[PDB]
Amino acid sequence: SNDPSGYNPAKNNYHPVEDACWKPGQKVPYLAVARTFEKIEEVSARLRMVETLSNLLRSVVALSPPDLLPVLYLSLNHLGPPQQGLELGVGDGVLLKAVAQATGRQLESVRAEAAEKGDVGLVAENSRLMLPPPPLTASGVFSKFRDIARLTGSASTAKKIDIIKGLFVACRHSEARFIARSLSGRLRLGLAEQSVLAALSQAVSLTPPGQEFPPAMVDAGKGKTAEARKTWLEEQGMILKQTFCEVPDLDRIIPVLLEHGLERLPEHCKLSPGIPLKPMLAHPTRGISEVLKRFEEAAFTCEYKYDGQRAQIHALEGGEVKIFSRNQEDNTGKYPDIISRIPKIKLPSVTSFILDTEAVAWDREKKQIQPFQVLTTLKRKEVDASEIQVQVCLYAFDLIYLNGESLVREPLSRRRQLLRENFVETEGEFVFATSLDTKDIEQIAEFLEQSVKDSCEGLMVKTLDVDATYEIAKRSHNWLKLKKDYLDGVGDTLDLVVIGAYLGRGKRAGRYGGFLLASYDEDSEELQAICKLGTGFSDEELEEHHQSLKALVLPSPRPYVRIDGAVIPDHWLDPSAVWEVKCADLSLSPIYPAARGLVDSDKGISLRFPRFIRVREDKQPEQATTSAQVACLYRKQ
DNA sequence: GCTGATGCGTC
DNA sequence: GTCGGAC
DNA sequence: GTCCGACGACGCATCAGC
Ligand SMILES: *OP(=O)(O)OC[C@H]1O[C@@H](n2cnc3c(N)ncnc32)[C@H](O)[C@@H]1O
């Protein structure tokens, strides 16, 4: 049948058996996957991407079920289940070395072209005494990626380069483009987890697994009205999405899906302590008015938004405790102190639970929350080891599971009541998030002010009874986050000088994707780098920046511009442009020189979450925010 | 082994 | 983390 | 609203060049 180079999963009236490019029972060719990625990359309509991926997956299900799992992971650019912690350990540097070797070019030449094009894939693809090696297969490429991720220790980079070179030598057509993009962590299809799930549920709905070959049912949706088909696929999609959000692990879900089908899947893969789940997320909301409009017909609660790290705390029946990050990373080992206090935070009647909390640094002498930067510096504190002044404190804000019962479909009013009834607070150790139930604008505004005075970032807002569940599948950003620095005109902005630009990648290829900013150190008469900047401009504004900063490019840096440890710009810029920049906090920096010596001996100051607001056309660089002003902003935190 | 660089997680 | 583009 | 991928500071385990 068909050579894979001609595979077209975007064709009208795609037939999963007749339009595939491999025979039943054989390994899915990687070129089939690459061709699907091509047809996805070529469009901007996400629903067209889903249809195209679904066509590939239908053929995988019909012909080669064992390759469904690797094909899905390749489509997500995942190495496996997130809690297993697999990491390629391949940066652009190592990848470029492998490309240079495979293409027979000097490294600097490949590096410069990759920076200019904004994409390593284009260099690997568009850049033989031996006949080709066997064609790449989807499962074979996936296992090679996992081989790369497993390599560790001295000389491991050399072994990784050998695997990558081996892949590139076997590539044809567009394969090297997507293998290089995968290895760089930037597959950039425009299609990610939500679209992959929609494609998968559509595929197994239209082309059910488990059919003796050839499958008699290849397009089950076909004969329905447009409305009935849409409703049916939505319902099937929700079955998969709700299961995935409770058990975000394709290693678990896919074998069940293939053996038992989608309808039975929830009976086999269930929320359970010890298995990380997807956390509820929050939509940014730029003011109280937007909150009220969003929750127009629903009573809601406001809670302090604590400035720490999420900690999903699992207590299994029998006493084992596990702690997971918001991205399902196993964090159990960072918190032995916490784990030994679990019998202290729960009533004796609690036999199992899943808590949603923020881990925060707490200074027990000052009795106050410390900045996130302090928290990330805390070393693990063994129980029976000597006590230190600052410790991790949990601020609990949700209860997902209790005594063998999932609370995912319960309204927050009930989950919060069970949380408050069944758990016990200890200052500096385990505390319920401070909250207020109101619709009064002035009360909300005063509560927002108080959260900031109490060392928090702002407010989380959550409905209590209407659309108030923990069902990520229904709405992943079911909560709202309201920060003072979202309010334009509110909070501290800086006027900073653009001293450098960085070539853009991906969506920014062909212009500047980032910029190096500086404050003005009056005492030493120098500009000091303070942060980089890569968000806040519209596409049109970024085009304007590219055009006006192009003219200011210098071959060699000005001698009064100090950047110390900052990334050297691709283009140094005549210090001229002054931009208004907003941030959330100021941090003590290990690399930036701004205001060094004014607050800390060895460290300058940088900006947390900086973003572009507007050009200060009226201001000259001498009128930029000074480094003394930067120190003033830091101290008043 | 020493030293500086960095991939990748957190936010 | 923030942000804006495509739908 | 939803989904996606541009881009930020920073800590550190672990890497390569000697
Ligand atoms: O900015 P963001 O989308 O990452 O915000 C969500 C995160 O905020 C943290 N957090 C802190 N305090 C709360 C409360 N009270 N409720 C919910 N989330 C909260 C979480 O870590 C969350 O990921």
XYZ file of C-alpha atoms (C1' of nucleotides) and ligand atoms in Angstrom:
696
model
C 0.000 0.000 0.000
C 0.761 3.737 -0.290
C 4.241 5.053 0.450
C 4.067 7.111 3.684
C 5.511 10.218 1.989
C 2.118 10.576 0.282
C 0.064 10.021 3.439
C -2.722 12.631 3.678
C -4.645 12.574 6.981
C -6.254 15.910 6.020
C -8.090 14.524 2.991
C -11.849 14.768 2.641
C -13.772 11.576 3.473
C -10.678 9.999 5.020
C -10.983 6.203 5.272
C -8.946 4.731 8.173
C -8.114 1.469 6.350
C -7.869 2.477 2.700
C -6.120 5.828 3.252
C -3.498 4.568 5.706
C 0.090 4.141 4.509
C 0.966 0.895 6.292
C -0.470 -2.564 6.397
C -2.657 -3.992 9.188
C -0.605 -5.236 12.123
C 2.612 -3.476 11.113
C 4.383 -0.718 13.010
C 3.104 2.782 12.296
C 5.795 4.625 10.259
C 7.094 7.812 11.818
C 6.643 9.518 8.449
C 2.898 8.965 8.858
C 3.155 10.895 12.121
C 5.361 13.565 10.553
C 2.930 13.979 7.657
C 0.113 14.434 10.171
C 2.184 17.042 12.009
C 2.704 18.811 8.663
C -1.016 19.042 7.928
C -1.596 20.259 11.494
C 1.161 22.893 11.340
C -0.185 24.170 8.009
C -3.562 25.304 9.429
C -4.604 27.744 12.143
C -8.102 26.354 12.859
C -7.735 24.118 15.902
C -10.810 22.056 14.974
C -9.229 21.258 11.613
C -6.116 20.137 13.506
C -8.266 17.873 15.667
C -9.945 16.315 12.634
C -6.566 15.660 11.012
C -5.041 14.058 14.100
C -8.230 12.053 14.625
C -7.812 10.591 11.146
C -4.318 9.336 12.000
C -5.520 7.906 15.318
C -8.443 6.128 13.655
C -5.986 4.336 11.364
C -3.719 3.496 14.300
C -6.698 2.020 16.177
C -7.907 0.074 13.138
C -4.528 -1.278 11.990
C -1.935 -1.051 14.762
C -3.476 -0.640 18.239
C -0.147 -1.185 20.061
C 1.197 2.012 18.464
C -1.618 4.221 19.779
C 0.238 5.006 23.001
C 3.554 6.088 21.386
C 1.712 8.047 18.692
C -0.197 9.984 21.355
C 2.965 10.733 23.355
C 4.721 11.929 20.198
C 1.748 14.191 19.435
C 1.982 15.684 22.943
C 5.792 15.757 22.912
C 5.662 13.874 26.219
C 8.086 11.176 27.323
C 5.570 9.358 29.501
C 3.390 9.893 32.574
C 4.401 13.161 34.255
C 4.973 11.751 37.751
C 7.777 9.494 36.460
C 9.867 12.611 35.852
C 11.531 11.645 32.578
C 13.563 14.474 31.046
C 15.400 14.553 27.730
C 18.302 16.505 29.170
C 18.862 17.900 25.666
C 19.125 21.647 25.200
C 19.559 23.603 22.004
C 23.315 23.380 22.530
C 23.475 19.583 22.433
C 20.860 19.405 19.686
C 22.805 21.861 17.513
C 25.980 19.822 17.991
C 24.148 16.746 16.699
C 22.745 18.699 13.731
C 26.182 20.089 12.881
C 27.596 16.565 12.909
C 24.811 15.014 10.827
C 24.745 17.833 8.235
C 28.531 18.085 7.937
C 28.643 21.774 8.906
C 30.566 23.837 11.437
C 28.709 24.311 14.703
C 28.772 28.115 14.572
C 27.229 28.047 11.118
C 24.356 25.850 12.257
C 23.901 27.885 15.444
C 23.690 31.167 13.528
C 21.197 29.787 11.004
C 19.033 28.277 13.743
C 18.923 31.653 15.504
C 18.098 33.513 12.272
C 15.325 31.099 11.272
C 14.072 30.844 14.854
C 13.736 27.070 14.560
C 16.176 24.163 14.745
C 13.834 21.938 12.739
C 14.262 23.967 9.562
C 18.049 23.699 9.842
C 18.005 19.936 10.451
C 15.615 19.274 7.563
C 16.640 21.633 4.758
C 20.432 21.434 5.188
C 25.174 9.457 1.035
C 27.800 6.761 0.509
C 25.475 4.453 2.468
C 21.983 3.275 1.638
C 19.335 4.561 4.055
C 18.787 2.656 7.298
C 15.341 1.152 7.938
C 12.542 3.744 7.994
C 11.751 5.243 11.364
C 8.708 3.909 13.185
C 6.575 5.855 15.649
C 7.238 3.408 18.478
C 10.927 3.280 17.557
C 11.361 7.058 17.663
C 9.450 7.229 20.935
C 11.632 4.556 22.524
C 14.759 6.377 21.291
C 13.548 9.572 22.971
C 13.135 7.567 26.177
C 16.611 6.071 25.686
C 17.946 9.635 25.492
C 16.032 10.628 28.624
C 17.385 7.626 30.562
C 21.046 8.406 29.830
C 22.784 9.978 32.828
C 26.217 10.616 34.260
C 29.486 11.611 32.676
C 29.703 11.036 28.909
C 25.901 10.883 28.669
C 25.729 13.867 26.298
C 28.011 12.066 23.843
C 25.687 9.050 23.921
C 22.654 11.310 23.443
C 24.303 12.958 20.439
C 24.887 9.481 18.989
C 21.199 8.591 19.331
C 20.116 11.917 17.832
C 22.548 11.575 14.928
C 21.220 8.071 14.314
C 17.698 9.466 14.079
C 18.726 12.240 11.679
C 20.532 9.771 9.404
C 17.347 7.685 9.134
C 15.020 10.657 8.529
C 13.460 11.478 5.189
C 11.121 14.235 4.025
C 9.840 16.206 7.053
C 10.894 13.709 9.743
C 14.030 15.595 10.789
C 12.020 18.806 11.196
C 9.738 17.294 13.807
C 12.394 15.155 15.490
C 14.524 18.266 16.020
C 11.538 20.306 17.218
C 10.609 17.504 19.619
C 14.146 17.293 21.013
C 14.229 21.080 21.482
C 11.043 20.967 23.563
C 9.270 23.175 21.008
C 7.095 20.967 18.806
C 4.789 23.995 18.273
C 2.020 22.288 16.332
C -0.656 24.643 17.615
C -2.259 21.466 18.969
C -1.661 20.276 22.521
C -3.293 18.330 25.359
C -6.896 19.494 24.915
C -6.872 18.966 21.155
C -5.146 15.584 21.467
C -7.860 14.440 23.873
C -10.582 15.696 21.513
C -8.905 13.878 18.624
C -8.596 10.653 20.609
C -12.198 10.574 21.809
C -13.427 11.358 18.298
C -11.202 8.650 16.814
C -12.310 5.811 19.083
C -15.921 6.982 18.754
C -15.856 6.889 14.952
C -13.584 3.806 14.724
C -14.105 1.725 17.879
C -11.162 -0.314 19.185
C -11.355 -4.070 19.514
C -12.795 -4.876 16.080
C -11.552 -7.989 14.330
C -9.740 -6.847 11.202
C -10.989 -5.519 8.882
C -13.253 -3.403 11.108
C -16.885 -3.335 10.034
C -17.367 -0.012 11.870
C -14.964 2.596 10.495
C -17.083 5.801 10.722
C -19.822 5.328 13.323
C -20.899 8.970 13.201
C -21.675 9.196 9.623
C -25.457 8.563 9.434
C -26.498 10.938 12.228
C -27.817 14.457 11.840
C -25.180 17.153 12.247
C -26.640 18.075 15.643
C -26.913 14.504 16.944
C -23.358 13.748 15.825
C -22.066 16.885 17.559
C -23.874 16.110 20.818
C -22.668 12.501 20.700
C -19.011 13.411 20.163
C -19.222 16.056 22.904
C -20.575 13.457 25.336
C -17.886 10.931 24.378
C -15.253 13.653 24.626
C -16.369 14.444 28.170
C -16.056 10.781 29.201
C -12.401 10.788 28.167
C -11.632 14.275 29.463
C -13.082 13.683 32.916
C -11.229 10.368 33.209
C -7.986 11.965 32.016
C -8.271 14.867 34.475
C -8.614 12.384 37.347
C -5.958 9.975 36.007
C -3.719 12.062 33.613
C -1.690 8.996 32.675
C -1.924 7.534 29.174
C -0.004 4.448 30.326
C -3.092 3.645 32.424
C -5.879 4.942 30.197
C -4.897 3.670 26.749
C -4.674 -0.087 27.497
C -8.085 0.148 29.196
C -9.523 2.145 26.309
C -8.296 -0.430 23.792
C -9.476 -3.458 25.784
C -12.740 -2.223 27.333
C -13.750 0.795 25.243
C -14.497 4.400 26.064
C -17.885 3.908 27.746
C -16.407 1.538 30.344
C -13.238 3.588 30.869
C -14.470 5.495 33.980
C -15.155 2.185 35.741
C -11.468 1.220 35.423
C -9.622 4.554 35.811
C -10.858 6.436 38.868
C -9.609 9.269 41.034
C -7.584 7.733 43.828
C -5.170 8.916 46.552
C -1.623 8.286 45.393
C -2.421 8.930 41.718
C -1.858 12.636 40.895
C -4.774 14.468 39.299
C -5.072 17.632 37.236
C -5.529 20.694 39.481
C -8.150 23.361 39.023
C -6.717 26.477 37.401
C -7.603 30.149 37.401
C -8.420 32.652 34.720
C -6.786 36.100 34.987
C -9.369 38.785 35.711
C -8.403 42.424 35.293
C -10.810 43.963 37.808
C -13.706 43.459 40.164
C -16.204 44.376 37.429
C -14.996 41.465 35.315
C -15.333 39.134 38.313
C -18.910 40.262 38.922
C -19.798 39.923 35.244
C -18.263 36.449 35.077
C -20.103 35.329 38.239
C -23.222 37.367 37.460
C -25.738 34.753 38.636
C -23.636 32.866 41.190
C -22.717 33.550 44.792
C -18.959 33.317 45.211
C -16.172 33.419 47.778
C -12.938 35.400 47.678
C -9.756 33.920 49.128
C -6.238 35.203 49.628
C -3.980 34.092 46.791
C -0.927 32.849 48.652
C 2.530 33.313 47.150
C 4.077 29.863 47.258
C 3.933 26.559 45.395
C 0.965 24.266 44.915
C 0.966 21.080 46.949
C -1.582 18.350 46.257
C -1.473 16.217 49.405
C -2.618 12.595 49.139
C -3.289 10.513 52.250
C -3.875 6.902 51.252
C -5.966 4.491 53.253
C -3.408 2.920 55.581
C -1.316 6.034 56.214
C 1.046 6.551 53.272
C 1.260 10.203 52.226
C 2.312 11.523 48.820
C 2.626 15.144 47.722
C 2.402 16.235 44.094
C 3.108 19.481 42.288
C 0.568 21.223 40.081
C 2.083 19.356 37.107
C 1.938 15.915 38.763
C 5.619 15.880 39.757
C 6.318 13.786 42.844
C 7.260 16.243 45.614
C 6.895 13.789 48.503
C 10.604 14.061 49.322
C 10.651 17.792 49.767
C 8.352 17.770 52.750
C 9.250 15.158 55.422
C 8.355 17.658 58.133
C 4.972 18.161 56.593
C 4.304 14.442 56.192
C 5.016 13.696 59.855
C 2.394 16.266 60.903
C -0.457 14.776 58.841
C -1.961 12.891 61.834
C -1.995 16.366 63.425
C -3.986 18.177 60.703
C -6.903 15.722 60.455
C -9.560 14.420 62.795
C -9.178 10.782 63.880
C -12.166 9.864 61.681
C -10.336 10.879 58.478
C -8.950 7.732 56.827
C -7.949 9.107 53.405
C -7.997 12.432 51.610
C -6.694 14.597 48.818
C -6.079 18.208 49.865
C -5.401 21.180 47.614
C -2.969 23.548 49.326
C -0.361 26.237 48.770
C 3.020 25.517 50.337
C 4.419 28.802 51.638
C 7.583 29.855 53.431
C 6.744 30.928 56.992
C 9.149 32.716 59.346
C 8.186 31.547 62.817
C 9.930 34.394 64.637
C 8.319 37.213 62.652
C 5.153 35.092 62.340
C 4.801 36.180 58.727
C 4.851 34.756 55.218
C 8.163 34.996 53.367
C 8.621 35.616 49.630
C 8.492 32.812 47.086
C 12.231 33.247 46.524
C 12.839 32.223 50.150
C 10.585 29.188 49.751
C 12.536 27.877 46.758
C 15.727 28.153 48.842
C 14.430 26.035 51.738
C 16.245 22.729 52.026
C 14.336 19.625 53.043
C 13.918 19.504 56.827
C 14.158 16.013 58.288
C 12.079 15.370 61.384
C 14.356 15.061 64.446
C 16.785 17.477 62.744
C 17.458 20.910 64.207
C 14.779 23.548 63.672
C 15.352 26.578 61.439
C 13.600 29.940 61.581
C 11.768 29.540 58.240
C 9.627 26.502 57.438
C 7.020 25.404 54.908
C 3.455 26.232 55.968
C 0.438 24.803 54.137
C -2.531 27.034 53.336
C -5.370 24.643 52.515
C -8.091 25.771 50.126
C -9.786 22.672 48.722
C -10.679 19.076 49.525
C -10.927 16.766 46.513
C -11.421 13.356 48.144
C -12.326 12.190 51.634
C -12.656 8.770 53.281
C -12.908 6.813 50.052
C -15.258 9.267 48.317
C -14.383 11.639 45.495
C -15.699 15.171 46.034
C -15.000 16.218 42.442
C -18.709 16.603 41.607
C -19.586 18.330 44.869
C -20.029 22.120 44.973
C -17.316 24.146 46.680
C -19.717 25.075 49.483
C -19.821 21.384 50.434
C -16.126 20.702 49.797
C -15.183 23.742 51.889
C -17.510 22.669 54.698
C -15.956 19.193 54.740
C -12.495 20.767 54.689
C -13.272 23.036 57.644
C -15.020 20.278 59.617
C -12.476 17.481 59.174
C -9.125 19.298 59.434
C -7.399 21.201 62.230
C -5.401 24.420 61.917
C -1.972 25.085 63.421
C -0.416 28.509 62.910
C 2.675 28.305 60.735
C 1.946 24.670 59.836
C -1.547 24.164 58.405
C -4.047 27.003 57.966
C -7.235 27.479 55.965
C -7.056 30.158 53.291
C -8.467 33.470 54.516
C -11.788 34.038 52.771
C -14.781 36.350 52.390
C -18.248 35.538 51.027
C -19.704 38.685 49.478
C -20.883 40.439 46.351
C -20.283 43.988 47.658
C -17.741 45.801 45.474
C -16.285 47.865 48.305
C -15.866 44.809 50.543
C -14.095 42.926 47.750
C -11.813 45.881 47.039
C -10.912 46.250 50.721
C -10.323 42.491 50.948
C -7.986 42.710 47.945
C -6.068 45.511 49.672
C -5.840 43.442 52.845
C -4.518 40.352 51.048
C -1.665 42.456 49.667
C -0.920 43.881 53.121
C -0.915 40.273 54.379
C 1.845 39.279 51.901
C -0.389 37.641 49.272
C -0.572 38.215 45.525
C -4.252 39.137 45.367
C -7.480 37.136 45.440
C -8.812 33.875 44.114
C -12.548 34.004 43.383
C -14.654 30.842 43.273
C -18.372 30.177 42.940
C -19.959 28.403 45.888
C -22.956 26.521 44.463
C -23.426 27.263 40.737
C -20.869 25.648 38.410
C -18.841 25.203 41.587
C -17.457 21.681 41.182
C -13.887 20.406 40.821
C -14.635 18.988 37.351
C -11.666 20.185 35.302
C -13.204 18.578 32.204
C -16.156 20.989 32.349
C -13.941 24.078 32.706
C -10.225 23.907 33.470
C -10.079 27.577 34.597
C -13.177 27.519 36.784
C -11.649 29.927 39.322
C -10.704 33.562 38.807
C -7.490 35.245 39.955
C -7.549 38.972 40.713
C -4.220 40.732 41.294
C -3.732 44.445 41.970
C -1.058 44.583 39.275
C -3.659 43.501 36.694
C -5.452 46.836 37.172
C -3.918 49.218 34.639
C -2.871 52.434 36.340
C -2.556 50.562 39.661
C 0.745 49.290 40.996
C 4.320 50.298 40.330
C 5.645 50.613 36.792
C 9.209 51.379 35.771
C 10.564 53.342 32.829
C 13.466 51.244 31.565
C 15.960 51.597 28.723
C 16.146 48.971 25.992
C 19.823 48.007 25.755
C 19.595 44.811 23.710
C 17.388 42.515 21.690
C 17.142 38.741 21.275
C 16.160 37.018 18.052
C 12.719 35.513 18.213
C 11.843 31.852 17.932
C 8.720 30.150 16.620
C 5.883 32.677 16.464
C 8.574 35.387 16.808
C 10.894 34.036 14.097
C 12.237 36.820 11.904
C 11.977 39.604 14.490
C 12.945 40.182 18.118
C 11.237 37.935 20.630
C 12.819 39.514 23.691
C 14.667 42.557 24.930
C 17.203 43.422 27.600
C 16.210 46.342 29.832
C 18.227 48.563 32.146
C 17.738 51.105 34.886
C 19.932 54.197 35.213
C 22.558 54.107 37.976
C 23.085 57.815 38.556
C 25.997 57.437 40.976
C 28.185 55.446 38.559
C 26.668 57.019 35.413
C 25.882 53.617 33.917
C 22.883 51.690 32.660
C 22.470 48.446 34.613
C 20.574 45.509 33.153
C 17.553 44.742 35.335
C 15.546 42.166 33.395
C 14.628 40.776 30.028
C 11.222 41.414 28.506
C 9.219 39.202 26.176
C 5.503 39.779 26.681
C 2.969 42.601 26.771
C 3.269 43.855 23.196
C 0.706 43.134 20.536
C 2.048 41.596 17.333
C 1.767 45.007 15.661
C 3.644 46.715 18.494
C 6.363 44.077 18.253
C 6.639 44.806 14.530
C 7.008 48.489 15.424
C 9.745 47.635 17.933
C 11.583 45.500 15.383
C 11.489 48.380 12.900
C 12.618 51.148 15.255
C 15.226 49.122 17.162
C 16.725 47.687 13.958
C 18.189 51.140 13.275
C 19.897 51.206 16.700
C 21.919 47.991 16.424
C 25.516 48.333 17.581
C 28.414 46.042 16.620
C 29.915 46.317 20.103
C 28.420 47.253 23.490
C 28.502 50.713 24.976
C 31.075 50.907 27.807
C 28.571 52.489 30.224
C 26.127 49.556 29.874
C 26.640 46.872 32.539
C 24.909 43.488 32.246
C 27.133 41.289 34.473
C 25.543 37.816 34.329
C 22.644 38.543 31.973
C 22.374 36.712 28.661
C 24.406 38.633 26.105
C 21.965 40.146 23.559
C 22.013 38.914 19.992
C 21.891 42.614 19.025
C 23.286 45.321 21.253
C 21.224 48.499 20.975
C 22.116 52.185 21.170
C 20.487 53.022 24.542
C 17.648 55.243 23.374
C 14.202 53.681 23.714
C 12.432 53.964 27.074
C 9.535 51.602 27.766
C 7.035 51.502 30.606
C 7.271 48.079 32.250
C 5.030 46.566 34.902
C 5.975 43.790 37.299
C 4.454 41.986 40.272
C 7.420 41.950 42.657
C 11.114 42.777 42.724
C 13.557 39.966 43.462
C 17.166 39.718 44.594
C 18.977 38.542 41.507
C 21.942 36.180 41.124
C 22.857 37.707 37.732
C 21.434 41.218 37.238
C 23.564 44.213 38.317
C 20.682 46.675 38.775
C 20.979 48.397 42.161
C 23.643 45.955 43.378
C 25.007 47.159 46.702
C 21.943 49.277 47.518
C 20.000 46.467 49.222
C 22.374 43.482 49.106
C 26.160 43.314 49.001
C 26.525 40.771 46.194
C 23.122 40.818 44.457
C 21.301 43.335 42.323
C 17.578 43.449 41.702
C 15.333 42.077 38.950
C 11.622 42.098 38.111
C 9.119 39.303 38.705
C 6.695 38.711 35.814
C 7.777 41.828 33.871
C 5.652 42.915 30.944
C 5.586 45.727 28.396
C 2.929 48.426 28.863
C 3.771 51.172 26.357
C 6.593 53.196 24.874
C 7.588 56.332 26.790
C 8.093 58.424 23.678
C 8.318 61.502 25.916
C 11.253 60.179 27.965
C 14.979 60.114 27.258
C 17.196 57.398 28.770
C 18.465 59.853 31.396
C 14.854 60.049 32.607
C 14.540 56.285 33.092
C 13.842 54.829 36.512
C 17.035 55.033 38.550
C 18.706 52.180 40.382
C 18.092 54.062 43.635
C 14.392 54.159 42.746
C 14.551 50.411 42.071
C 15.987 49.874 45.555
C 13.174 51.996 47.009
C 10.568 49.834 45.273
C 12.256 46.683 46.566
C 12.430 47.839 50.186
C 8.774 48.866 50.428
C 7.746 45.246 49.876
C 37.965 16.985 41.101
C 37.363 21.879 40.031
C 34.710 25.294 37.963
C 31.344 27.507 35.229
C 27.301 26.456 32.387
C 22.631 24.964 31.900
C 18.091 22.079 31.254
C 14.168 22.109 33.604
C 11.310 22.543 37.283
C 8.805 26.190 40.195
C 6.287 30.606 39.914
C 4.200 33.036 35.730
C 1.960 37.270 31.725
C 0.409 38.069 27.542
C -1.962 38.305 22.910
C -3.619 35.621 18.539
C -6.971 32.417 16.369
C -11.179 30.489 16.737
C -14.002 31.780 26.917
C -10.884 28.189 25.191
C -6.636 26.727 23.668
C -2.099 27.636 22.448
C 2.763 29.090 22.351
C 5.617 33.247 22.445
C 8.264 35.149 26.307
C 9.898 36.392 32.033
C 13.155 35.362 37.149
C 15.265 32.035 39.671
C 17.153 27.549 42.266
C 19.734 23.701 41.600
C 21.135 18.936 40.066
C 24.037 17.795 36.910
C 26.558 18.512 32.855
C 31.051 19.431 29.970
C 35.943 21.248 29.407
C 39.931 21.226 31.729
O -1.354 32.674 38.864
P -1.880 31.267 38.775
O -2.777 30.863 37.638
O -0.635 30.242 38.712
O -2.716 31.098 40.123
C -3.142 29.811 40.547
C -2.284 29.289 41.663
O -2.420 30.090 42.849
C -2.097 29.297 43.979
N -3.012 29.638 45.063
C -2.663 30.388 46.144
N -3.687 30.572 46.977
C -4.745 29.898 46.377
C -6.086 29.713 46.754
N -6.598 30.235 47.896
N -6.870 28.986 45.928
C -6.370 28.470 44.800
N -5.127 28.586 44.355
C -4.340 29.315 45.188
C -2.124 27.831 43.530
O -0.853 27.249 43.629
C -2.638 27.897 42.091
O -1.894 27.018 41.264
